Design a protein around this ligand. Structure first.
Ligand SMILES: *[C@@H]1O[C@H](CO)[C@@H](O[C@@H]2O[C@H](CO)[C@@H](O)[C@H](O)[C@H]2NC(C)=O)[C@H](O)[C@H]1NC(C)=O
Ligand SMILES: *[C@@H]1O[C@H](CO)[C@@H](O[C@@H]2O[C@H](CO)[C@@H](O)[C@H](O)[C@H]2NC(C)=O)[C@H](O)[C@H]1NC(C)=O
Ligand SMILES: *[C@@H]1O[C@H](CO)[C@@H](O[C@@H]2O[C@H](CO)[C@@H](O)[C@H](O)[C@H]2NC(C)=O)[C@H](O)[C@H]1NC(C)=O
Ligand SMILES: *[C@@H]1O[C@H](CO)[C@@H](O[C@@H]2O[C@H](CO)[C@@H](O)[C@H](O)[C@H]2NC(C)=O)[C@H](O)[C@H]1NC(C)=O
Ligand SMILES: *[C@@H]1O[C@H](CO)[C@@H](O[C@@H]2O[C@H](CO)[C@@H](O)[C@H](O)[C@H]2NC(C)=O)[C@H](O)[C@H]1NC(C)=O
Ligand SMILES: *[C@@H]1O[C@H](CO)[C@@H](O)[C@H](O)[C@H]1NC(C)=O
Lengths: 595, 98
């Protein structure tokens, strides 16, 4: 009966909040002060949380799921009843964890040695990522691109084939058709009177939104190709694809390292307020106190006053071994801490606004039950953090926060320099993200057999992304598995939808703050009505369907690409005038070796 | 490490009458199945403990409460405020209260 499930969850909601607390408090003491008497302090305290949750999970199947009427207590029950693994045979369950540990340690400890000196050998993160991000030598970028895929990616090919079979068995025992349908279960919504969403409906909404970005991406692809021919003459065709090893990093995920070759007006400095911070003696604490004044300006609460003692805003005065990585912690019981090692720079002035945005999202849904204290889907949590960073990087906000000469002149040449640096990171990553999840979805359902994995991968690079390989690759390579998110078992569609939600939030908040100009000049400071539009979504958590959360801000029930294109229309107008003598589009027949 | 000595009751058959008190420790029975003094599904111990810890956000830290309740049965009198006496004058027509 349904009233027994309510009494089940309230014993759960008070044993979990304490056991999650000290399992996360011990993870704080390891992260900010590393010993090994802290790693053993967090492994036993971490396993008491994991052993407790599988005990309550096997108690949750005593209650049926379709004999429930209240939507909230049904949502908590389905998130706890989830079997996930453990549906496999107990010798297949230990084979899967052996593969996931072997693929993870090949990626982090794989070395590449030089053919002129076999005694010097580079790892990926120090040394191989620096070549792909800084070099202008064609022959050295071609060496680092091919040798990472032929010496490390060939080890992951027999391991990734066994990984697909075991993950499809686990997904079909949980009544999905494949493992790709299991990943799309985040966006599913069942029976809330007009707000429903199918797991197959996500596939059409991604492909419908993508064919409206292809006019903008084609003009960006044509402008970068014309600028790369001056940097690498006799290597690039003026009507063809771009070679895969000249894109700024190892995989071509972000084009953000191509800015020094593709800058529109290099005689205008892109605005940088780092010298005005060290001329006014701003400490470590000023960067957060101006960040807290931004959020109280819009109508959001202060920091919790436990935030100022418990947090560790710099690396300590001790030479203290403590993972230095910006992050926002939500230990529980209303205890919010930020861990970062901040330097006096406009870079960490902006990520301070980003990391505080995770805190203000966390402080808002802290009145829901324990199992609904996440973002409404996997994409909302990063998207609310980046609309705080866009509004703080504007020169309108910088001159009113005291950091820009009240006699500063923004010219139309510097807005093109700023918008093109945004499009190399935002627009340049959208066909990469769409192509990769489309390839992984077709591998799991079996539309691509294993004798055509690397054949269909490079046909989709030339057609969707416009990127050609420099050396042909047969079915002994596995080039997707040489990325971190593929070999470490992560979903990748959250980076596509976060980019679309980010400009839907920003365009909906700037109509409430009564903006008049272009969308990229907007700032939501001093408003109250925009914050009330934002706070009505922030407090929902997972208690409502995410389509119901979007109408509280945007006014629509689906993700939309038209606010993303309105941000880049000053660039799209300027790009169509720079490509009057160029060719827009590419040919899938040209190759850098096929002459 | 958590002060686990401060408990509260989280299951009862029926809400309390005003100023009523209940220190029993019988195993609660949520479902219809009888409990027979042992724990299990739908048979819960009725007391939980605040695990208080010094690094808790406000609203999670312990507050001490005192409830004063003045009652007036039908006696002849009892405790009350503490009157105050001013200064007594002399040799002047005055309005006095002794
Ligand atoms: C890292 O934290 C641990 C524990 O928080 C520190 O180790 C000991 O902590 C106790 C407190 O319970 C002290 O009485 C001991 O003196 C600490 N050990 C030592 C060797 O000092 C540890 O000190 C912290 N790390 C550093 C570098 O201070
Ligand atoms: C079941 O649904 C009802 C409404 O559909 C929820 O009722 C609300 O409960 C809160 C506190 O529990 C009250 O403050 C509200 O006034 C109630 N609303 C109404 C309309 O009466 C109820 O909370 C849900 N059950 C659970 C366990 O959350
Ligand atoms: C979870 O996996 C189990 C198999 O281990 C599935 O079958 C359940 O088996 C248990 C006994 O171990 C029964 O109590 C359940 O009734 C069975 N399933 C149900 C509730 O029909 C079970 O179907 C899986 N649960 C999910 C999430 O589908
Ligand atoms: C920035 O604004 C100036 C001012 O309008 C633009 O200069 C004009 O450019 C057009 C097209 O080349 C000419 O027909 C006008 O005669 C120019 N104006 C003047 C006063 O000379 C300039 O092109 C703009 N730059 C960008 C990048 O948009
Ligand atoms: C936006 O908010 C800021 C912060 O309160 C306002 O800045 C104040 O501006 C006045 C006059 O411009 C100064 O006298 C104050 O010293 C400023 N305050 C601070 C804390 O620096 C700003 O005026 C607001 N914008 C509008 C349009 O009202
Ligand atoms: C936030 O804190 C400041 C001082 O730190 C205070 O003046 C302000 O009133 C606080 N905000 C609210 C809503 O009380």
């Amino acid at each position: 009966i349904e009233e027994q499930a309510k009494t089940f969850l309230d014993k759960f909601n008070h044993e979990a909040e304490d056991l999650f607390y000290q399992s996360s408090l011990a993870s704080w003491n390891y992260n900010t002060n590393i010993t090994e008497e802290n790693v053993q302090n967090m492994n036993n305290a971490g396993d008491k949380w994991s052993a407790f949750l599988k005990e309550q999970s096997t108690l949750a199947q005593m209650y049926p799921l379709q004999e429930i009427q209240n939507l909230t207590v049904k949502l908590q029950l389905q998130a706890l009843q989830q079997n996930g693994s453990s549906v496999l045979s107990e010798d297949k369950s230990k084979r899967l964890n052996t593969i996931l540990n072997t693929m993870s340690t090949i990626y982090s400890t794989g070395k590449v040695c030089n053919p002129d000196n076999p005694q010097e050998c580079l790892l990926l993160e120090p040394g191989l990522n620096e070549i792909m991000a800084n070099s202008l030598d064609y022959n050295e970028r071609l060496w680092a691109w091919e040798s990472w895929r032929s010496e490390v990616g060939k080890q992951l090919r027999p391991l990734y084939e066994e990984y697909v079979v075991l993950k499809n068995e686990m997904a079909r025992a949980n009544h999905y058709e494949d493992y790709g349908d299991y990943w799309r279960g985040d966006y599913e919504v069942n029976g809330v009177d007009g707000y429903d969403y199918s797991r197959g409906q996500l596939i059409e909404d991604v492909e419908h939104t993508f064919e409206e970005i292809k006019p903008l991406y084609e003009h960006l692809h044509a402008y970068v190709r014309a600028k790369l021919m001056n940097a690498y003459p006799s290597y690039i065709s003026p009507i063809g694809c771009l070679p895969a090893h000249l894109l700024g990093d190892m995989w071509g995920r972000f084009w953000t390292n191509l800015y020094s070759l593709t800058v529109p007006f290099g005689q205008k400095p892109n605005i940088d307020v780092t010298d005005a911070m060290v001329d006014q003696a701003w400490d470590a604490q000023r960067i957060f106190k101006e960040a807290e004044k931004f959020f109280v300006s819009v109508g959001l609460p202060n920091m919790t006053q436990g935030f100022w003692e418990n947090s560790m805003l710099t690396d300590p005065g001790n030479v203290q071994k403590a993972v230095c990585h910006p992050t926002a912690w939500d230990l529980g019981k209303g205890d919010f801490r930020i861990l970062m090692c901040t330097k006096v720079t406009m870079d960490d002035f902006l990520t301070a606004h980003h990391e505080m945005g995770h805190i203000q999202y966390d402080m808002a849904y802290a009145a829901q039950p324990f199992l609904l204290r996440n973002g409404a889907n996997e994409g909302f949590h990063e998207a609310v953090g980046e609309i705080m960073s866009l509004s703080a990087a504007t020169p309108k906000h910088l001159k009113s926060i005291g950091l820009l000469s009240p006699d500063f002149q923004e010219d139309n040449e510097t807005e093109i320099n700023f918008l093109l640096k945004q499009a190399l990171t935002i627009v340049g990553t959208l066909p990469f993200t769409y192509m990769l999840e489309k390839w992984r979805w077709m591998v799991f359902k079996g539309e691509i057999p294993k004798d055509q994995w690397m054949k269909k991968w490079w046909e989709m690079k030339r057609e969707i992304v416009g990127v050609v390989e420099p050396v042909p690759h047969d079915e002994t390579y596995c080039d997707p598995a040489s990325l971190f998110h593929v070999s470490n078992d992560y979903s990748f569609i959250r980076y596509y939808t976060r980019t679309l939600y980010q400009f839907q939030f920003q365009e909906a908040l700037c109509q409430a703050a009564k903006h008049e100009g272009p969308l990229h000049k907007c700032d939501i400071s001093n408003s109250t009505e925009a914050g009330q539009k934002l706070f009505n979504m922030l407090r929902l958590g997972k208690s409502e369907p995410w389509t119901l959360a979007l109408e509280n801000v945007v006014g629509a029930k689906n993700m939309n690409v038209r606010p993303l294109l309105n941000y880049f229309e000053p660039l799209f107008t300027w790009l169509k005038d720079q490509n009057k003598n160029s060719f827009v589009g590419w040919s899938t027949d040209w190759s850098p070796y096929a002459d | 490490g958590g002060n686990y000595n401060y408990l509260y009751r989280l299951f009862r058959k029926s809400n309390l009458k005003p100023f009523e008190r209940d220190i029993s420790t019988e195993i609660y029975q949520a479902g219809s199945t009888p409990c027979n003094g042992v724990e299990g599904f739908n048979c819960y111990f009725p007391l939980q403990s605040y695990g208080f810890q010094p690094t808790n956000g406000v609203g999670y830290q312990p507050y001490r409460v005192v409830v004063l309740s003045f009652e007036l049965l039908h006696a002849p009198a009892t405790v009350c405020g503490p009157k105050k006496s001013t200064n007594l004058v002399k040799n002047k027509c005055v309005n006095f209260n002794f």
